[PDB]
Design an enzyme around this catalytic site. Sequence first.
Site, PDB file in Angstrom:
ATOM      1  N   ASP A 133       0.746  -1.255   0.000  1.00 17.19           N
ATOM      2  CA  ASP A 133       0.000   0.000   0.000  1.00 17.19           C
ATOM      3  C   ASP A 133       0.779   1.311   0.000  1.00 17.19           C
ATOM      4  O   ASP A 133       0.199   2.367   0.261  1.00 17.19           O
ATOM      5  CB  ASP A 133      -1.057   0.001   1.116  1.00 17.19           C
ATOM      6  N   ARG A 188       0.688   6.681   0.441  1.00 19.88           N
ATOM      7  CA  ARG A 188      -0.024   5.600   1.107  1.00 19.88           C
ATOM      8  C   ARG A 188      -1.438   5.582   0.542  1.00 19.88           C
ATOM      9  O   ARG A 188      -2.033   6.633   0.297  1.00 19.88           O
ATOM     10  CB  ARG A 188      -0.059   5.865   2.618  1.00 19.88           C
ATOM     11  N   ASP A 224      -5.947  -1.300   4.182  1.00 20.58           N
ATOM     12  CA  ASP A 224      -4.962  -1.914   5.059  1.00 20.58           C
ATOM     13  C   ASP A 224      -4.620  -3.241   4.387  1.00 20.58           C
ATOM     14  O   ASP A 224      -5.511  -4.045   4.103  1.00 20.58           O
ATOM     15  CB  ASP A 224      -5.577  -2.147   6.446  1.00 20.58           C
ATOM     16  N   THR A 225      -3.344  -3.424   4.061  1.00 22.45           N
ATOM     17  CA  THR A 225      -2.883  -4.646   3.408  1.00 22.45           C
ATOM     18  C   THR A 225      -1.977  -5.447   4.330  1.00 22.45           C
ATOM     19  O   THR A 225      -1.318  -4.886   5.214  1.00 22.45           O
ATOM     20  CB  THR A 225      -2.079  -4.347   2.112  1.00 22.45           C
ATOM     21  N   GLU A 230       1.230  -7.415   5.632  1.00 23.38           N
ATOM     22  CA  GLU A 230       2.635  -7.112   5.400  1.00 23.38           C
ATOM     23  C   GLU A 230       3.370  -8.303   4.789  1.00 23.38           C
ATOM     24  O   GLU A 230       2.810  -9.393   4.688  1.00 23.38           O
ATOM     25  CB  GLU A 230       3.307  -6.636   6.689  1.00 23.38           C
ATOM     26  N   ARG A 271       3.657  10.855   4.885  1.00 23.07           N
ATOM     27  CA  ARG A 271       3.242  10.163   3.665  1.00 23.07           C
ATOM     28  C   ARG A 271       2.031  10.834   3.032  1.00 23.07           C
ATOM     29  O   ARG A 271       1.158  11.332   3.730  1.00 23.07           O
ATOM     30  CB  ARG A 271       2.914   8.694   3.959  1.00 23.07           C
TER      31      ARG A 271
HETATM   32  C1  LIG Z   1      -4.183   4.981   5.608  1.00 26.13           C
HETATM   33  C2  LIG Z   1      -3.801   5.935   6.765  1.00 26.13           C
HETATM   34  C3  LIG Z   1      -2.833   5.599   7.650  1.00 26.13           C
HETATM   35  N1  LIG Z   1      -2.476   6.445   8.699  1.00 26.13           N
HETATM   36  C4  LIG Z   1      -1.422   6.066   9.663  1.00 26.13           C
HETATM   37  C5  LIG Z   1      -2.125   5.377  10.850  1.00 26.13           C
HETATM   38  C6  LIG Z   1      -1.143   4.302  11.225  1.00 26.13           C
HETATM   39  O1  LIG Z   1      -0.248   4.745  12.244  1.00 26.13           O
HETATM   40  P1  LIG Z   1      -0.472   4.453  13.811  1.00 26.13           P
HETATM   41  O2  LIG Z   1      -0.437   2.996  13.855  1.00 26.13           O
HETATM   42  O3  LIG Z   1       0.835   4.966  14.553  1.00 26.13           O
HETATM   43  O4  LIG Z   1      -1.557   5.335  14.248  1.00 26.13           O
HETATM   44  C7  LIG Z   1      -0.348   4.027   9.985  1.00 26.13           C
HETATM   45  C8  LIG Z   1      -0.800   2.749   9.327  1.00 26.13           C
HETATM   46  O5  LIG Z   1      -0.036   2.618   8.162  1.00 26.13           O
HETATM   47  P2  LIG Z   1       0.425   1.225   7.592  1.00 26.13           P
HETATM   48  O6  LIG Z   1      -0.746   0.320   7.589  1.00 26.13           O
HETATM   49  O7  LIG Z   1       1.177   1.500   6.361  1.00 26.13           O
HETATM   50  O8  LIG Z   1       1.443   0.723   8.701  1.00 26.13           O
HETATM   51  O9  LIG Z   1      -0.533   5.121   9.098  1.00 26.13           O
HETATM   52  C9  LIG Z   1      -3.102   7.673   8.871  1.00 26.13           C
HETATM   53  O10 LIG Z   1      -2.832   8.459   9.767  1.00 26.13           O
HETATM   54  N2  LIG Z   1      -4.081   7.994   7.970  1.00 26.13           N
HETATM   55  C10 LIG Z   1      -4.490   7.203   6.909  1.00 26.13           C
HETATM   56  O11 LIG Z   1      -5.379   7.619   6.189  1.00 26.13           O
HETATM   57 CA   LIG Z   2      -0.986  -1.675   5.812  1.00 24.97          CA
END
Ligand SMILES: Cc1cn([C@H]2C[C@H](OP(=O)(O)O)[C@@H](COP(=O)(O)O)O2)c(=O)[nH]c1=O
Ligand SMILES: [Ca+2]
Length: 136
Positions: free
Chosen positions: A21, A35, A40-41, A43, A81
Amino acid sequence: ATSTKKLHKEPATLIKAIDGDTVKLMYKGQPMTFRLLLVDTPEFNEKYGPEASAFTKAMVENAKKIEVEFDKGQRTDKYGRGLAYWYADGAMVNEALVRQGLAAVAYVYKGNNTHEQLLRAAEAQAKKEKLNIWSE
Ligand SMILES: Cc1cn([C@H]2C[C@H](OP(=O)(O)O)[C@@H](COP(=O)(O)O)O2)c(=O)[nH]c1=O
Ligand SMILES: [Ca+2]
């Protein structure tokens, strides 16, 4: 109000694929990690993770034209991101991944969920067909 405002697609160039993602793109002439909004994908070390990463990699690398479409809320997350809907030759990456059961609808917030229903529809179909993550 902002709930009924329209979204706009913008050009971006692939620098390098990353995983299921996230991707590295040249946007407005600067390198950025993007992102996928609303998903949510799994890992790399999780089941279907290598598959999700491969799916996204192929979709972005084989795209003649990549576009990003920011929603109306937050454009960049707390990690710096870019949060957007990506399009590979007119086809939404966010939607395609979910439709194949390689990602689940997640992180759905306020006025940053313009395509929620569209994605939830794709997830319902992927689940109905018991595709990948929904085959468990
Ligand atoms: C998709 C998305 C992720 N995120 C943040 C939340 C998650 O961090 P926290 O866990 O610290 O709160 C993280 C998840 O990304 P990944 O799934 O790439 O790991 O990215 C946002 O803040 N907004 C979004 O719209
Ligand atoms: Ca993910």
